[PDB]
C-alpha cells in the first residue's frame, strides 16, 4: 500500500566521549579503535599503517591537537609527515555548551 | 559508439529482515553481522569495539530500540555511552504497509 | 527520551514516467523539466544553457538514447558536444520487469 | 601553524516544524517552500513542475502521508503518478519522544 | 592512450572571509548571499523563506552564533524556530592559527 | 603559490570484466572478491555473511540476474531473502556498444 | 518480477570543452554558465555574487589558472579574496592523452 | 544551550607523500598500504585481489602512471585488465607549486 522508509542510525547519534578517553594517557597516542572515528579514512585503508600522536588536548574546549605518523613500507618505522606542534586542532564530537 | 552506464545494486534492494531476526533472543544484543547494517559506521571502524543492546522491539511496527555499548580500551569491559531506556527507536528496513 | 530519526523521501520513490512522456514527440528534445532528472547536474548549473536531443527511445526496454547540446556563450546558438548517433543509451527509471 | 577545520551547519540542526504547519489546511497541499525539505530533489529540478498532496497526517506520530502530482508538459495540468491512498507515509523531522 | 582525470574545485579552497564580513552590522542578519555557505541547504530550497540572525560573533575565534527564522507561509512574517541565545555556535571557515 | 588539486581514481576507470568472469561457472555463485563490486555494501559489513547466486546472465547484454542469500546467525546455514527467479537483473559495468 | 535499476547520467559523460571556450577571451572571466561546472558550489549558492578571473590557461595541458572575486554586499563591487597569480591551477575536464 | 558541531578530519589534510615513496622501487608496484589511497575502492573490497603497477612517475609533476592487475579467482595469477602504457596518469596528492 504505502512506502514507509527505514533508517540507518548515524554513529554520532549514539556515541560521544570526553577527549581524555580518546588516547593512552602515558603514550599520548590515540587508541587504535578511535583513529577511524577522528580521521575520515579512504575505504579499505589499513589503519595499522598510521597512528595519531596527541600533542595537545583541552578539557574545557573538548578539543585535540594531533600529528599523524605513518609506517615507512621499507623500514617499518613510524615516521612523521613532511614540525613541532599539532598538524590539526579540532573538536572531535558535537557539544552542547557555552 | 554509445555509453551505456552500469550499476552497483544498493544492499537495501536485496536484503530485508523481520526485526526479531536481528538480535540474539536470549542475550538481547544485535548479531554482530547486522551492527553495520543498523549503524552508519565510519570507514575502517573496528566493530569488535562496540555492541548494540536491544532495549525494545516492535513486531507490529518493525522497529528496534537500542543502546550502544563500547569497549573501554584499558579494561576491555563494555560500557554504556554517557540512561534506563533506548538511545534510539527506529525502523531498520523499508516497509510497505498500513 | 529516545531519538527517533526522520526521513526525507528520495524523488525516485515517488516519481516514474514512461520514456515516451519524457520528450516533445515533434521536436524530439527532452522537456526542460526532466533534464535535471536524467542528468546529474552540478549544483547551481544554469539549465537554460543545455538541451537533450532524443536520438532513440525504446518502449519495450524503457530506454532513451540522447545527445547533449549546449549554448555557445558568444553566438547563443545550441551546438553539439565535440557524431551521428546517441552519446548515451540508458534506462532513466527503475523497472520491475522481464 | 595548525589547521582548525570549519563547519557548515546541517539544516536539520536548525529547523523543525510540527507536521500541521507543513501544508495548507484547506487545500491539503504541502506549502511550496517545504517540498524540497520533504523530498530529496535532483540538483536543478524545477519545483514548479510538482506538488505534494497530503492524504494523511498524524499529530501523535508526527508523520505525513503524501501523493506526488506533476505538471504534464503539454496540457500544464497536474496529474498523479502511475491509487486511492498515500504513496508514502513518513516522519519528516527527527523527534525525541516515546 | 591514458586517462587523465580532471577536477572541479571545492568552493572552500577559493573563498574565505572574516566573520565580521558575513552579516549586516546594523541589522545583525547574515547577508543573503552567505546563508547557503553557512547552512547546508536541501537541493532546491527557497532561501527567501529563511534568515539567520547573528546573536554572537567572535573576532578572536572566527565563530558566529546564529538563530534561524523562517517565513510563516500564511502570514509571511519571519518567526523563530520552536530561546534567548544562539541555536548554534560554529566556526564557518577553515583557519590556520593558535 | 597556486593550489593544484590531486585525484583519487575511481575503481570503474581501471577495472571491467566480462560477466562470465564474475562467477564460478559450476557453482553459479559470484566469486567472493566481486560481491562488494556488484553490491553497495554498508561500511564495515562482514561479507562472509552473504553470497550472490547467479540465476541468469547475458553475454550479449553484459547483464547478471542475482539472488542474495545470507547466513542465519543461529544455524550458520545460507538462506534466501523473504522466489524462483532473480531479485535483480543489472549491467554491472559501463559498456560502449550498440 | 525482477528489479532492473535505472540510471541518471553524470554530466561529465556528456559534456567536455577545450579550455579556451570556458572564458571570454577579451575580459578573461569564465562565462557565467561554466562557473558551477568549475567550482563545486554549495547548494542554493547565488552565483551572481562571484566571478572567476582567468589568470593563466594552457592549451597543451588543458588547464586553467583562476582567481575568485566576490561581490561585497555593501558596495556591490567585486573584490578579490584575502595575490598576483592564480589561486588554483587545475585541469577542468577529463582528458585522454600523452 | 547552543549546538557546537564537531569535526572528523579528512585524511588529505594530514597525509601527503612524494610520489617516489608510493611504490617499491625495484618491483614497481605501489605498496599495498597506499592502494586504497590512490584508488577509490568500493566499500568492503578485498585489496588482496588487486595490485597497481607503476608504468611511469614524474618527480617534477608529482604524477604516477599506473596499470591495474587483478587476481584471476581460478588460477590465482595476477592478470592485466582487458595495453603497453599506463591506464591512468594522475597527481595523487594536492600540491602548492608552479
Ligand atoms: Cl575530558
Ligand atoms: Cl518480527
Ligand atoms: Cl513508453
Ligand atoms: Cl502537529
Ligand atoms: Cl572578523
Ligand atoms: Cl561474457
Ligand atoms: Cl583549448
Ligand atoms: Cl618524488
Ligand atoms: Na570500509
Ligand atoms: Na541546487
UniProtKB/Swiss-Prot annotation, chains A, B, C, D, E, F, G, H:
Disulfide bonds: none annotated. It comes from the Bacteria. It is found in: Cell membrane. Belongs to the adhesin P1 family. The protein is the major adhesin mediating the attachment of this mycoplasma to the ciliated epithelium. This is Adhesin P1. The lineage of its organism: Bacteria, Bacillati, Mycoplasmatota, Mycoplasmoidales, Mycoplasmoidaceae. The chain holds residues 1251 to 1351 of 1444 of the full protein.
Amino acid at each position: 500500500i504505502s512506502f514507509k522508509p527505514g533508517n540507518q542510525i548515524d554513529f554520532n547519534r549514539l556515541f560521544t566521549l570526553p577527549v581524555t578517553e580518546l588516547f593512552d594517557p602515558n603514550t599520548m597516542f590515540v587508541y587504535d579503535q578511535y583513529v577511524p572515528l577522528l580521521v575520515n579514512l579512504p575505504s579499505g585503508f589499513d589503519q595499522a599503517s598510521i597512528r595519531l600522536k596527541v600533542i595537545s588536548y583541552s578539557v574545557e574546549n573538548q578539543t585535540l591537537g594531533v600529528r599523524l605518523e605513518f609506517k615507512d613500507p621499507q623500514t617499518q618505522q613510524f615516521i612523521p609527515v613532511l614540525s613541532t606542534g599539532p598538524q590539526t586542532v579540532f573538536q572531535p564530537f558535537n557539544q552542547w555548551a557555552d
